[PDB]
Amino acid sequence: SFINYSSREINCKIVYYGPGLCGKTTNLQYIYNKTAAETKGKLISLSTETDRTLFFDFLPLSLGEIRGFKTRFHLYTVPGQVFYDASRKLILKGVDGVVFVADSQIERMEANMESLENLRINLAEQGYDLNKIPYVIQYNKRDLPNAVTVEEMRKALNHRNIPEYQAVAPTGVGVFDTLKAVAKLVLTELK
Amino acid sequence: SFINYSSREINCKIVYYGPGLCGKTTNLQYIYNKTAAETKGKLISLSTETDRTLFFDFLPLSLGEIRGFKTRFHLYTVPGQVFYDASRKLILKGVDGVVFVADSQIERMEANMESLENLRINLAEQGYDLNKIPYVIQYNKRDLPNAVTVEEMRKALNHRNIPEYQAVAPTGVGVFDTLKAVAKLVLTELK
Ligand SMILES: Nc1nc2c(ncn2[C@@H]2O[C@H](COP(=O)(O)OP(=O)(O)O)[C@@H](O)[C@H]2O)c(=O)[nH]1
Ligand SMILES: Nc1nc2c(ncn2[C@@H]2O[C@H](COP(=O)(O)OP(=O)(O)O)[C@@H](O)[C@H]2O)c(=O)[nH]1
Numbered sequence: 001s002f003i004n005y006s007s008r009e010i011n012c013k014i015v016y017y018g019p020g021l022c023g024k025t026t027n028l029q030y031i032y033n034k035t036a037a038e039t040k041g042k043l044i045s046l047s048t049e050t051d052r053t054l055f056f057d058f059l060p061l062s063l064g065e066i067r068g069f070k071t072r073f074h075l076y077t078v079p080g081q082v083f084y085d086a087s088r089k090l091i092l093k094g095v096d097g098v099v100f101v102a103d104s105q106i107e108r109m110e111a112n113m114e115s116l117e118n119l120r121i122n123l124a125e126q127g128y129d130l131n132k133i134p135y136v137i138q139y140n141k142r143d144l145p146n147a148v149t150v151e152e153m154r155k156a157l158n159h160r161n162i163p164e165y166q167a168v169a170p171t172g173v174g175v176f177d178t179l180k181a182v183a184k185l186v187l188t189e190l191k
Numbered sequence: 192s193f194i195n196y197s198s199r200e201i202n203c204k205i206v207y208y209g210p211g212l213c214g215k216t217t218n219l220q221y222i223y224n225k226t227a228a229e230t231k232g233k234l235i236s237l238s239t240e241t242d243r244t245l246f247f248d249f250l251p252l253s254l255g256e257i258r259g260f261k262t263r264f265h266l267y268t269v270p271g272q273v274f275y276d277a278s279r280k281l282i283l284k285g286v287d288g289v290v291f292v293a294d295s296q297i298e299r300m301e302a303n304m305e306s307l308e309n310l311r312i313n314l315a316e317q318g319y320d321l322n323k324i325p326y327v328i329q330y331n332k333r334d335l336p337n338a339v340t341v342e343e344m345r346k347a348l349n350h351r352n353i354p355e356y357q358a359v360a361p362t363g364v365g366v367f368d369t370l371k372a373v374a375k376l377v378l379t380e381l382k
Contacts, residue, residue, distance in 0.1 A: 043240065048233040 001094045003069070009059070010069045012186050013094050014179075016077040017119050018101035019111035023140040024077040025054055026169035027101060031075065031179060032056055034172070051087035054079045066190050073183060089122050097134035097186040098123075099178055101169075102157055104139050104147035109156060116157055134185030136163040138178045143168045192285045200250070200263045203377050204285050205370075207268040208310050209292035210302035214331040215268040216245055217360035218292060222266065222370060223247055225363070242278035245270045257381050264374060280313050288325035288377040289314075290369055292360075293348055295330050295338040300347060307348055325376030327354040329369045334359045 002011040016024040032043045035058050046053040057074040078091045100119060102112045120130045139153045148156075150166060158164055163181045167174030193202040207215040223234045226249050237244040248265045269282045283289075291310060293303045311321045330344045339347075341357060349355055354372045358365030 042242075045238045047236045047238075050233070 001096045004072075008069050010066060010071045010190060011057070011074060012071060012096035012190070013074045013076060014097045014099065014182055014186065015091055015095045016075065016099045016101055017088075017091075017115065018140075019103055019108060019115040020081040022101045022103035022108065022112075022115075023138075023167070023169040024101050025079040027099070027138070027140075027167075027175055027178070028054055028056070028075055028077055030169060030172045030175045034176070036061070050084050051082075051090070052079055053077070053087075053091065063187075066187070071187065071190065075179075085118070085122075088118060089125065092119075092122050092126060092128070095123075095128065095133070096189070097182040098130075098136075099182050100135070100137045100157075101140050102137060102153060104141040104153065105144060106146050106148055109148060112153075112157055131160060134182055134189055136165065136178055136182045136185070138165050138167050138174065140167045140169050140174075142166045142173070143171075192287045194260070195263075199260050201257060201260045201381060202248070202263045202265060203287035203381070204265045204267060205288045205290065205373055205377065206282055206286045207266065207290045207292055208279075208282075208306065209331075210294055210299060210306040211272040213292045213294035213299065213303075213306075214329075214358070214360040215292050216270040218290070218329070218331075218358075218366055218369070219245055219247070219266050219268055221360060221363045221366045225367070227252070241275050242273075242281070243270055244268070244278075244282065254378075257378070262378065262381065266370075276309070276313075279309060280316065283313055283317060283319070286314075286319065286324070287380070288373040289321075289327075290373050291326070291328045291348075292331050293328060293344060295332040295344065296335060297337050297339055300339060303344075303348055322351060325373055325380055327356065327369055327373040327376070329356050329358050329365065331358045331360050331365075333357045333364070334362075 001013055016027055018024055039061055040058040041056055043056045055076045057072055059070055059072045063071055076091055078087050123130050137158055141147060165174045165178040169175055192204055207218055209215055230252055231249040232247055234247045246267045248263055250261055250263045254262055267282055269278050314321050328349050356365045356369040360366055
């Protein structure tokens, strides 16, 4: 979404979205911890009285070039409990790709559906269509005993059959598979 | 230091500098709390594993214009204990004015002198001269019984006789006088 014509880099924004405490910070921290130090910037936590943000950027060395430009990935999330919907509206500004992180716990299903509809509403207000943008869903907390089946989560949250990944974010299970999937969809859009 | 030609604003950066726990957050919070809501942005706290930052901006209504441009002030500080000198080097990037906040406690005099010399060294590395830049010193914690006299602080920290203010930052004593002094010196440089 942002071209740096001098440093010859395409900057793209990947937003991790989902209900409070679903595992968005965990995904970003795990990715950050496993990313080579020379390819990434700092892990930045931003806080105000009203809102919170967690983000970082990285330039993967493995990737080629799109018309002589290298692609830099910026991973953004609104962590924890959200008190103002404005922060979820702000996080989506200039989004290139979205990872919806669903909390697999039975007690968080209503929250997952509320957040997924909130994502659709906030994207539409900015001229983005959730059915057309690079978008992947992660069924997080697969380790917990109170987790709903993959079939129940698919039926409730993935009617359009978009890429889905089962994860246990603290151990990194499914974390890089979710990231690689949305990043590939973003690169295809850029090409 | 940054001209916004479209919004017709001169943006200037004021850095509060001094040893850890000297009263820099207190100064910024007191100023922020007494600034009219319609003239300021959010009070932003930034944190990484290595460093911390506290900042906000405000456009005072009382001020006139410099060649049809309004002046917006950005107040920046590295709060708390500092683990990496790089954060003190980074905070000074694009600085227009500096407030050195000295902790008046006897046990913090060595820290004040170390920090003041560190400010001089970090400014020189970026091509700034501490003897030429808008710079004011604040003798904070004047309320404490273990406070050194104003004469002892002047002798140890103000050999060049630059503007000095006695403060008790939590009660706001000397806080706006310190700010108005450095801001006036910045405005003269801009004119
Ligand atoms: N059991 C389990 N706990 C998880 C998982 N993902 C995150 N958590 C925990 O859930 C809590 C909230 O997660 P966090 O990443 O901070 O949520 P965020 O608000 O979406 O950023 C923390 O205690 C995490 O360790 C998971 O896959 N399994
Ligand atoms: N007694 C007294 N305490 C102060 C004064 N200024 C700051 N403090 C206290 O010193 C501690 C550290 O101050 P803080 O502003 O957070 O320091 P910073 O690290 O420079 O940002 C806090 O407990 C403050 O309330 C002062 O003028 N007098």
